[PDB]
Amino acid sequence: PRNRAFEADWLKFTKTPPTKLQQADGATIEIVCEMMGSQVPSIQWVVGHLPRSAEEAPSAIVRVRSSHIIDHVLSEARTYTCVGRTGSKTIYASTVVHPPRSSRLTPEKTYPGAQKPRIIYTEKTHLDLMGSNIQLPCRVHARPRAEITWLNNENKEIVQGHRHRVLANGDLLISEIKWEDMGNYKCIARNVVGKDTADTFVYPVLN
Amino acid sequence: ADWLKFTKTPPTKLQQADGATIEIVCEMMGSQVPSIQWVVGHLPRSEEAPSAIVRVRSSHIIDHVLSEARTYTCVGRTGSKTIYASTVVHPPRSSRLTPEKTYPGAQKPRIIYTEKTHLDLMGSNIQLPCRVHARPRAEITWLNNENKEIVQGHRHRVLANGDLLISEIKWEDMGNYKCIARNVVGKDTADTFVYPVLNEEDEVLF
């Protein structure tokens, strides 16, 4: 019904993970996957296992990004597969990461010190229906654990309230969305060594 | 019904370390295609693209030592809307360098004007910026939504100023377009997400 809102189930990579990466000694690898599709697509990362092979209503359309962090030197080449799902649709893409040819570090041992926050699960774009309850993710990789703050569509810090709740896992829950809620939402993740941020565009999918 | 909002405001105060290059960033989102202009040393006083929505990021580069504190204002415009925000940058306490003189030698590319998101009408022509600060001038390469290098062709053209022109966009054009700016020192990259839509009556252009 060529407003895209009526075409569930569909799912497309918007950032396909690299086919191959070469790890430098001591480097932290971040493998990024991004996809967009009907409803709220989920992304799972699978290590070391290669792939082997409806309502009469509009749906949300969500663009979601997930990062896999390798913060140790690999002992051997390993495969990492991004698996995306929404409804009955599944898409996959894999990355082979190669270890450095030589290393002055212990392989497969997590790098020791503090680590700057990285937001590793986030929605870039959330197009939805008015009145819906939405939950915007902000999952973080950080040592020590990051403090999470959300800004709303007026750049004001969000405090816990009747229609807005910040969850312990970093998610922002907004109940019964309306036009006045539309726009940009920013997650800020901070610890003693640094900060990361991520923006989510929330907008009506229809009319 | 135009709207325009900051998504990243520049810092209100910055301290320049001696010999340091400062990059001031402002990001905004709005209807049509908002533009960002930087105004130096003048504190504020008191194309059209219907159906488009764009996130735009602009950087101002200070690659000289300041002789005195200076103000930098990010001014955004779209339709009849104007927004702005300012930064004061302070010079180093002491400097062994000549003030206001551009730092010598090569500089790694910085992409200083880019759209993070370009939502626009099916059938329309879009022009995605990739403005670069680099010495020597950077080589610019775009990759399409399948990570393949874009060559000059029928619906795709790369301009001398770095812009990617995509003619008569269709649903299959949806996705991320990467600008790579490279010179002898290194590279910078940026992604632009393109989302083709229909107009207010669910039609493509024309």
UniProtKB/Swiss-Prot annotation, chain A:
A molecular function GO annotation: insulin binding
Induction remarks: By 20-hydroxyecdysone.
Principal subcellular localisation of the protein: secreted
Domain of life assignment: Eukaryota
Gene Ontology CC: axon; extracellular space; plasma membrane
Gene Ontology biological process terms, A to Z: axon guidance; dendrite self-avoidance; determination of adult lifespan; homophilic cell adhesion via plasma membrane adhesion molecules; negative regulation of insulin receptor signaling pathway; negative regulation of lipid storage; positive regulation of entry into reproductive diapause; positive regulation of insulin receptor signaling pathway
Cysteine disulfide links: 33-82, 138-187
Occurrences of domain Ig-like C2-type (ranges): 1-92, 117-203
Organs and tissues of expression: Detected in several sites including the ventral neuroectoderm, the tracheal pits, the pharynx and esophagus, and specific neuronal cell bodies, where it is primarily expressed.
Job description of the protein: Essential developmental role during embryogenesis, in particular the normal development of the nervous system. May be involved in some aspect of cell adhesion.
UniProt-recorded name of the protein: Neural/ectodermal development factor IMP-L2
Annotated gene: ImpL2
Residues of the full protein shown: 48 to 264 of 267
